[PDB]
Amino acid sequence: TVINNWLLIEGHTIGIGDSIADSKTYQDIQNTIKKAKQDVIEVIEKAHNNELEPTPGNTLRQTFENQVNRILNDARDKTGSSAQKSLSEYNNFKSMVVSGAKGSKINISQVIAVVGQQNVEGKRIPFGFKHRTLPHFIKDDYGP
């Protein structure tokens, strides 16, 4: 009762301004994504040139998938951390996450920085079409 009346005084809301981040934050997120995509390209080139060597207990396909997933997840986490650094005290997404009332830091990160890897059955989006994911992509494209 008493906290709801004080809330009548102070008030609480969620808006677009909570989702927006600083321009520097967006630039850093973009730079992180560029670096990650370039690193995934490098790993794919290593695999194509047969430089890659299988991790114990894993096939070359499985170790390549694990390395790519690790790079993508690390970039996603870094972008999320940058977005969370951007958050102000007044930010209401942060208010709800800090209070624990609703939401999580994952949700803030997806809202502000990067939605992240879409995975089905514990693997990246499968090659549903013949050796490709969608008809718009070229065959044998393992990029992000």
């Binding site: 997840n73 879409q118 990246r124």
Partner: peptide
């Protein structure tokens, strides 16, 4: 929808 370690 997040990653391989998260949720779909």
């Amino acid at each position: 929808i997040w990653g391989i370690g998260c949720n779909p």
